[PDB]
Amino acid sequence: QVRQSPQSLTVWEGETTILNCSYENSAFDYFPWYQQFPGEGPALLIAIRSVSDKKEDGRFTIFFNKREKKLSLHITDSQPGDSATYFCAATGANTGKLTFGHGTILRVHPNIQNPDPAVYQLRDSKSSDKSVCLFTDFDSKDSDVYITDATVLDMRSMDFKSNSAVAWSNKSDFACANAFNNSIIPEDTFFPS
Amino acid sequence: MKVTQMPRYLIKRMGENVLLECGQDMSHETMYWYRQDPGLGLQLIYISYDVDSNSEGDIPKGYRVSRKKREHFSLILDSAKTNQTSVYFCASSLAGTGNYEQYFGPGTRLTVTEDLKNVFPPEVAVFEPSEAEISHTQKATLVCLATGFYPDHVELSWWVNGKEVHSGVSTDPQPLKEQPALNDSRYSLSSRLRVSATFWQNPRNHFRCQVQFYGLSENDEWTQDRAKPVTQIVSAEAWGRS
């Protein structure tokens, strides 16, 4: 068993990401981390040996603590392009194959230079009752922005990569104020008519 | 130096034979088949250490493997089950121990479905930018919604004036179930394209969101009244407006 925590993590550009791992087999002696970008296969990123307590490669650093059988990957100065799933893996002289942890999903929001939280309703270019609410800078947890009744009759999707969220409906009575928890969203959220 | 996989997308009915293929040009001795499922990690199905030297991984049940050339490694499901819906990755390394870097293919997303009548192409709609956004920011965000599709095998792109664009595009990372509580739920995906207010305001400009859907093939039988959900593109287009 190789165990990672957390299952997923959301960070801001610039912040230090810390990814935790632990292992039960004290016969593990080699610990590579694999990085998997969206829609791609995993790729070897950085590895350390049991004989060593710290491995550095630019922005990426594995600290390794043999005794508590714990290690962690640090990414200083996190970049949007670091958004990926990170797998901690382990093997020893006397363990077959390579043993992967279940991975940590990392999402890095790009920095927001001038926050403009705003909600706009957009009409379908083709004649219908359909509309979309577009929430710019909605994050200036993320999904708490949404009303998830039971009432709204909508569908919802957030884009961590552009700091935006949408919600949409086929109901012509649909209004963007009822899609969102106004108590929780950014304080200066603009709702132009 | 690359690992290749074919096909990239697959939709099969339960009980069918399925063949996944992996190539590799690095003269690597060892090859691997993994599957990747939500929450679980990379799970090893079979490892191959030399031609006809295949060894079980942790989850070999329901799978068979073929290594007749050093450059290829085949994964076979003799009778596909719905719980074999997954993303399959092959890999290779120089020799078979864990100490060697594994090079992974780009993946095959396989969906095994109880009945092909569950397969639906997407509907696509483009939403015109809000005038309130244009007034406030001098920029105009179009939104594309791809809805109602199954399986979640799509690629969305934007075409402006007949050319694919990437600049100012942000697409949802993955399709989302419309009804997360249903195994056979259909999916939606959204995307935004942001341009300047003057670019949107030019009635000469046109903006097409295109979704490539990967669906049924010629081998698949179809008797339904509705159109056969084959691999196809579905688009929606809007024109700039003074």
Author numbering:
A (entry chain A): 11 to 150, 158 to 210
B (entry chain B): 2 to 243
The authors write:
The extracellular region of αβ TcRs comprises an α chain and a β chain, each consisting of Ig-like variable and constant domains. The signal resulting from this recognition event is transduced by CD3γɛ, CD3δɛ, and CD3ζζ.
Here we present a 2.0-Å-resolution crystal structure of the extracellular domains of a TcR (1F1E8hu) that recognizes the human leukocyte antigen DR2b molecule in complex with a myelin basic protein (MBP) antigen. To facilitate protein production and crystallization of a soluble form of 1F1E8, we exchanged its mouse constant domains with those of a human TcR (JM22) that has consistently provided high-resolution structures. However, the α-chain constant domain (Cα) shows a large structural deviation from all previously reported structures, including the identical sequence in JM22. Usually, the BC loop is 4 residues long; in the 1F1E8hu structure, 11 residues contribute to a significantly larger but flexible loop [of which residues 151–157 (QTNVSQS) are disordered]. The residues forming strand C in 1F1E8hu therefore differ from those in all other TcR structures (e.g., JM22); the sequence is effectively displaced towards the N-terminus. Overall, the structure of the 1F1E8hu Cα domain maintains a global IgC-like scaffold, but reveals a piston-like conformational change; from the BC turn to the DE turn, the residue positions are completely different, with many of those normally forming strands becoming involved in interstrand loops and vice versa. One very appealing theory is that flexibility and/or conformational changes in the TcR Cα domain could provide a mechanism to allow it to adapt to binding CD3 and hence play its role in TcR signaling.
